C-alpha cells in the first residue's frame, strides 16, 4: 500500500494485437431545393 512507503513539485508504429506486432512505414507502402451534399439529416 502507498501509505506504507518508507521529483519534488516545489523544486512511429501501429499496434497489431490478437502477441504484438508493430506496423509502420517499414512494412506498409502505398501503390498509386438545393444541391445534395453529404451530412447529417437530423
Amino acid at each position: 500500500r502507498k501509505r506504507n512507503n518508507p521529483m519534488n513539485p516545489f523544486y512511429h508504429g501501429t499496434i497489431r494485437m490478437f502477441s504484438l506486432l508493430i506496423l509502420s512505414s517499414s512494412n506498409c507502402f502505398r501503390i498509386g431545393t438545393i444541391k445534395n451534399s453529404s451530412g447529417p439529416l437530423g
Binding site: 490478437f18 506498409c28 502505398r30
Partner: protein, 49 residues
C-alpha cells in the same frame, strides 16, 4: 494493367479511390508432404524454422 508498374508481394491492407496500401509479405513454396511449423497467425521471428 499494361500502362502500370508491376505490383509487389503482400496483402491489400487499405483500399482507397485511386490507391492501395500493401502490407509486405513473402511467399514460400511448399510441396506435398512438407511440414509447417506453427499454427495460423503464429508469430515467427527472424531465423525461425
Amino acid at each position: 494493367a499494361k500502362k502500370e508498374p508491376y505490383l509487389k508481394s503482400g496483402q491489400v491492407l487499405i483500399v482507397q479511390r485511386d490507391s492501395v496500401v500493401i502490407r509486405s509479405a513473402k511467399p514460400y513454396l511448399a510441396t506435398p508432404g512438407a511440414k509447417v511449423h506453427g499454427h495460423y497467425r503464429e508469430i515467427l521471428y527472424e531465423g525461425d524454422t
